[PDB]
Design a binder for this molecule. Sequence first.
Ligand SMILES: O=c1ccn([C@@H]2O[C@H](COP(=O)(O)OP(=O)(O)O)[C@@H](O)[C@H]2O)c(=O)[nH]1
Ligand SMILES: O=C1C[C@@H](c2ccc(O)cc2)Oc2cc(O)cc(O)c21
Length: 427
Amino acid sequence: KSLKILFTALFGPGHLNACLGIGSLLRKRGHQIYFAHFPRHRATIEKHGFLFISLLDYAEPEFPIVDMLPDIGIIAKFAFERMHKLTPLELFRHASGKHTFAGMVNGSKGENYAMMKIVKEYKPDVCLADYLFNMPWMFTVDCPVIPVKSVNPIELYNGPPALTGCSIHDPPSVREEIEQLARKSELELESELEKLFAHFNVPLVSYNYAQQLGIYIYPGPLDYKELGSPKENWVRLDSSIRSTEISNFELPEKLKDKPGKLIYVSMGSLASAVTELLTMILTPLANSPHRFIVSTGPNGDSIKLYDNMWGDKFINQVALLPKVDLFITHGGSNSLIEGLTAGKPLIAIPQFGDQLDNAQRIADLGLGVRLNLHEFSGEKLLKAIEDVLNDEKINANVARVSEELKKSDSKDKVISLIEKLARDKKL
Ligand SMILES: O=c1ccn([C@@H]2O[C@H](COP(=O)(O)OP(=O)(O)O)[C@@H](O)[C@H]2O)c(=O)[nH]1
Ligand SMILES: O=C1C[C@@H](c2ccc(O)cc2)Oc2cc(O)cc(O)c21
């Protein structure tokens, strides 16, 4: 019996990519999938066979909605200046009580009204939402609503606070100060959401509450088993990667007959807007005796490439990763999971948000290194490349994690819970 299932997510290509994976799994089981998102993503959504609903067609006139992705460079460039000039402690100091994603909350009202009308009109059996924080509509719609989480899930446990990138080796003394500042900023977020929920007359809930079922995507071998069990109603899916239409990534002729290993570079869908960041990374790599393929980002046509490099604004990462020896990443979750699935070690240069946590996780479990912008130099990057390429131990740890991901059954249990909740309205 067919269910009607509606997905939505924030503007981030990463959050949408997460849900596409889930939707694919459900479409095979015979369900009708709908996706409410922005027009940039109509092509990939319909290509996967999901029905596309534009949020913009359902805006309230007084509360308009905007795809943030093309305007994101203002915000990205600020974060970059800050991250480049300050340690993560100093960053949290000079952040007053500001949470990393509070200004996002004020302007969420448009998306909220939209989702109310869309759920009313399409009368779905269940909804799923990949969002950074819960939203009033998820508690006003007739059907149940499953938050999906693709960011680092350390926030689902009682442990190091999220978004700080604390290590498991961090002594008692150095974490103490960061957790105070982070407890504080979590309270600023709670107060921002109160206004949002107040506006729609909905009892405030915790920012990452799962009423009945929550799904977080993250590799089981990287999950935080040492902190105990995740929060309630929260289930894990080890990975959620969409299938690629391309299967063979042909290498560019520019790089044929050039020495060394093949290395992929991407600072993601969002931070790659900052040309200063890419320039800072690539300039030293000109002298690295390897071949680089580079995602250059939306402003990539104004980024200089050297003889050992080839790139374009957007690359088929899932098709390419199998062919590389190393992946220099920003520590985004989807890139982390695609990278590990393909069996490749990582050098993570974290830019914002959950990336600090993922970066530290990669370092703590010996899956690569963490190299921060503040302590960044050509000499250090070039040496991290040589070190990770030649570290037998790291290369074996990554093979093991890969093997677990490629055979995981986490999907089977998750699907059941979705179907069950959709039909019974209870777990
Ligand atoms: O040239 C590129 C750059 C990025 N991506 C995709 O964009 C997503 C990036 O998500 P991630 O969580 O790694 O980073 P974020 O976008 O959250 O910064 C992943 O699915 C990548 O496969 C891609 O396909 N090609
Ligand atoms: O912290 C921020 C603010 C802003 C942002 C984007 C890019 C960047 O380089 C810096 C900040 O938007 C975001 C979007 C996210 O999905 C997750 C985030 O945490 C953030």
